Structure 1
Amino acid sequence: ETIELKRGSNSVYVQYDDIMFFESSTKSHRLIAHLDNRQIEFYGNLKELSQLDDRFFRCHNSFVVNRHNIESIDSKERIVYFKNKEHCYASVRNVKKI
């Protein structure tokens, strides 16, 4: 369950469940892997990442979440909470499918 996060000159290798979620941001050309203790930018695409494993799920245009690290979901406000206290958002379309 190892994923290579290509950073540029170097890669970081982490386990699937080290990842809370992946984020696309308009402020970077790189995606952001939200790990338990820090964020790491890397080159990738959300669609491909969602296909690596059933636990990964595209819940928003900007986010692919790791279901194994979800603590709770507020379906009304569409907020997804992770074990490390980070959150992301879910679209109306996908919130109930997470």
Structure 2
Amino acid sequence: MDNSVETIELKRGSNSVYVQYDDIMFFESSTKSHRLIAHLDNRQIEFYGNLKELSQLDDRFFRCHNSFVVNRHNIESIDSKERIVYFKNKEHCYASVRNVKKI
């Protein structure tokens, strides 16, 4: 366990990936049921979990949409007119009409 930097355990079977919080740009729901995808700097990791629980982990993790939890620390900008969140790695995700202002 990495104790000096906050980390999350993402489980894909008996295999665990420990990922540092700020490696993660955002989580999105998978097209595969009950799975999420962690979008990291240059990789994506699919695992079992739920968005509600991740948002309760830490203030930096905010439910910006029914299908997205964003890491506030890795937001570069927001196009609040179109409701798009841009991240430091050049990815983007969507914010909902109801949540976008609260980011």
Q: TM-score, normalised by structure 1?
A: 0.96
Describe the superposition over 1:22-62 as per-residue Cα deviations: whole angstroms up to 9, x where unpaired: 01033443100000011000111000000100000001010
Please give the root-mean-square deviation of Cα atoms over the aligned residues, in Å.
Answer: 0.9
Query: Would you say the 8 A contact 2:34–2:49 is kept in 1?
Result: no
Q: Percent identity?
A: 100
Q: Which runs of 5+ in 2 are unaligned?
A: 1-5
How is 1:49-88 mapped onto 2 (pairs within 5 angstroms)?
A: 49-88=54-93
**CA distance in 1 between partners of 2:21 and 2:93 (Å):** 18
> What's the secondary structure of 1:51's corresponding residue?
helix
1:47 aligns with 2:52: yes
**Counterpart Cα distance in 2 of 1:8 and 1:96:** 37
Does structure 1 retain, via aligned residues, the 8 Å contact 2:22–2:73? yes
Cα deviation for residue 80 of structure 1 reads 0.2
Give me the whole-angstrom Cα distance separating, in 2, the residues matched to 1:55 and 1:68. Answer: 7
Check 1:63–1:92 CA distance in 2 against 1; reply closer, same or farther (3 A cut). same
Contact 2:8 2:19 in 1 (8 A): yes
User: Where in structure 1 are there 5+ consecutive unaligned residues?
Assistant: none
Q: Relative to structure 2, which stretch is displaced further, 10-19 or 21-30?
A: 21-30
The count of residues paired between Structure 1 and Structure 2 equals 98
The reply on whether 1:23 has 2:6 as its aligned counterpart is: no
Q: Give the C-alpha shift of residue 8 in structure 1.
A: 1.3
Q: Contact 2:30–2:46 (CA<8 Å) still a contact in 1? A: no
TM-score normalised by the chain length of structure 2: 0.91
Q: Which runs of 4+ in 1 moved over 2 A?
A: 25-29
